[PDB]
């Protein structure tokens, strides 16, 4: 298991961007695309 790696120094570093914030970024992208077309990707 994941803990089994934690006996002999095989530590797993958690990602900086948690899945919640990845979902937040994806929701921001979706809102931008829906309510702004492609303009938001090239300026305001």
């Amino acid at each position: 298991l994941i803990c089994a790696q934690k006996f002999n120094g095989l530590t797993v570093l958690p990602p900086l961007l948690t899945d919640e914030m990845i979902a937040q970024y994806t929701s921001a992208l979706l809102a931008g695309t829906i309510t702004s077309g492609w303009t938001f990707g090239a300026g305001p």
Partner: protein, 49 residues
């Protein structure tokens, strides 16, 4: 791992014991129990799990 703003700015640093539920054993470091010494920070400025 040691969090530092890079000598230049300030020598004050903060450390991070990765991958440990430190609310038990490292927050309760006794005399020279923590690896990098300076047992003065047994409680430290703040211990944030």
């Amino acid at each position: 791992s040691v969090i530092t703003p890079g000598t230049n700015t300030s020598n004050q640093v903060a450390v991070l014991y990765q991958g440990v539920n430190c609310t038990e054993v490292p927050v309760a470091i006794h005399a020279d129990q923590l690896t990098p010494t300076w047992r003065v920070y047994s409680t430290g400025s703040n211990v944030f799990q």
